[PDB]
Amino acid sequence: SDGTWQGKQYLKEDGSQAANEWVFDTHYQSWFYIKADANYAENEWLKQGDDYFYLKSGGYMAKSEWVEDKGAFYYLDQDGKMKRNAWVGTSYVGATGAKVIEDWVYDSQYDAWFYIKADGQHAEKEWLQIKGKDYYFKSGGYLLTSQWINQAYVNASGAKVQQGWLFDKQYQSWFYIK
């Protein structure tokens, strides 16, 4: 390529000054975003339609990588686009792209609730107390709802029931929980 960096500015193959545009510099094999002031975007987000991109230090577009911003982790896909509402390995990124921690996740593809502990790992084959109530997560992390777990009963919200009547449809009989 005959494209060249002159400080933070990029001259294109034809010698024109890049500005307000993406450039792909084969010398780095990297995308870069050149701002309206003809300087490359660096250590910043770029919104383009619905999509977010992150320009790292030196202006390289982030891609297939995790970035930390204001104490939150964001994943950029192969094309540089910030992932939203998805599992990225064992992590879940929410609506804003931020890795979910200490919170519920409803995933329509498993039709199941999950809980990501503060430590960033999904609850799995275990009891947790979440906001003062008890919830049991199966293998794979799926919240158990409306069933007996040992001597305990978890209701439709997944919360262990403390006391009261339950009509069990499995046994077609009334139980009193104390």
Ligand SMILES: C[N+](C)(C)CCO
């Ligand atoms: C844009 N880079 C900083 C990567 C190259 C020019 O110095």
Ligand SMILES: C[N+](C)(C)CCO
């Ligand atoms: C970065 N572009 C949006 C220019 C293409 C996807 O990588």
Ligand SMILES: C[N+](C)(C)CCO
């Ligand atoms: C701009 N951020 C990537 C930090 C948030 C998008 O919801």
Ligand SMILES: C[N+](C)(C)CCO
């Ligand atoms: C539901 N998870 C994505 C958490 C695991 C599937 O194997």
Ligand SMILES: C[N+](C)(C)CCO
């Ligand atoms: C978010 N919760 C799992 C507690 C509600 C399920 O119905």
Ligand SMILES: C[N+](C)(C)CCO
């Ligand atoms: C739970 N009881 C059977 C005791 C009353 C509701 O019909």
Ligand SMILES: [Zn+2]
């Ligand atoms: Zn060249």
Ligand SMILES: [Zn+2]
């Ligand atoms: Zn898992």
